[PDB]
């Protein structure tokens, strides 16, 4: 899961949304480096350091940096695209007055631009410490966004709803970028005397794990089963009138192609699927599917980048969701089970994946994934995908001639780097990635405005590969 075949909904609203996608053209605005740097100096959030910025890079790197800037895009799974459409339909029918008025004329591309542009600058912790684009700082209050009890400064026109942030956890960012240092957790933006020990550049991908810190929102709604959340009143377990909550459960269940969700007392006694945790029950079957969406996007993206680079990809894989967001003891095993599954399902498509390197994992071996293993790939020019499992720094120099594809653990409601923008330069993987690359500008929708935008959305499709959304919709 997911399957290779996607089903096209026949209803007029979906057909119209796809028609509009099929009218989009790829942006091709010439990159003006001086214009970029000026935009960056006027960005609505302050940089604690400049060493990870375009302006601090050598002049002899300007040509490549211009290409890196134009190489950036947001990217979602083809199934995520259909989910976004179904979300718009659901909110236009069941949303509040506040929600209905902002989604009224919104296209798919517009919703994606909103998820990029209206996310907070930072947003971290179980109690939602935040800075909005308008500079307001506080804790909590996002549960009320987009409801008739919403209030300044957390209103739908300014910030995202938790229902939207849950969507945004499926929206990833990718670009080529200079590497400043080896990108260790504690790099803190340090500059090196020379880059003899590191790769000079590569692909950097912001992926987002599942978040369970905050009850009754995000992936907790789908994967966590608790006594207070999983009730008939909240739309679970479904001669009953449809409610907004129950309809929203249905579109997420249909996204995961699950035939039911659960009332707490109705959950089967089955430890191959369910794990008891402090909050209640953790459903590793739906967790595997949520991972599979992220991993499909990553692998199809890495394949496309590597094919255009003319060399195999070396993927630095991090445990998204397994750090400060770790929520179950078997979760890392579900992670690796899911990843092996997608490597095998995608099969011959991954001709240009060379090494998958799991960095900072506690399990040495899950299924066939252990250090030195090779997953065979039909017609792969090197016979298969090499697996590694050991700590490395993402920017370390490669002994093979391969394209480094560096993942970092991001956040659905924060700019790349997240607490980086609160001047916490050493914390989690997120500020470490911002400090050691150019993504704090190149993946920033308020700085890389011509390429990090909804109109440049790309789609990862099992059948059609990685395509700009216009090309993808036209092939449907
Ligand atoms: N010193 C280390 N060096 C490298 N990897 C490490 C280290 N310590 C832990 N890991 C592993 O690093 C991996 C990633 O752990 P995390 O960075 O917490 O990510 P998440 O997805 O759980 O939390 C994301 C949120 O935290 C940020 O604020 C974001 O913006 C979000 O708000 C795990 O395998 C860890 O075991
Ligand atoms: Cl500096
Ligand atoms: Cl050098
Ligand atoms: Ni083996």
Residue numbers in the entry: 25 to 262, 269 to 506
Show passages lifted from the paper.
Two of the representative proteins in this group, CG2909, and CG3568, are from Drosophila melanogaster, indicating potential evolutionary connections between the prokaryotic effector and the eukaryotic proteins. Encouraged by the clearly detectable ADPR-Ub hydrolytic activity of the two metazoan proteins, we solved their crystal structures in the ADPR-bound forms (ADPR-bound CG290912-498 at 2.28 Å and the ADPR-bound CG356825-508 at 2.00 Å). In addition, water molecules equivalent to w4 in MavL can be found in both structures with distances of 3.4 Å (in CG2909) and 3.3 Å (in CG3568), suggesting that this macrodomain class likely employs a similar catalytic mechanism. Interestingly, CG2909, CG3568, and Larg1 all harbor a hydrophobic residue (F137 in CG2909, F148 in CG3568, and V77 in Larg1) equivalent to F105 in MavL in their insertions.
Removal of ADP-ribosylation requires (ADP-ribosyl)hydrolases, with macrodomain enzymes being a major family in this category.
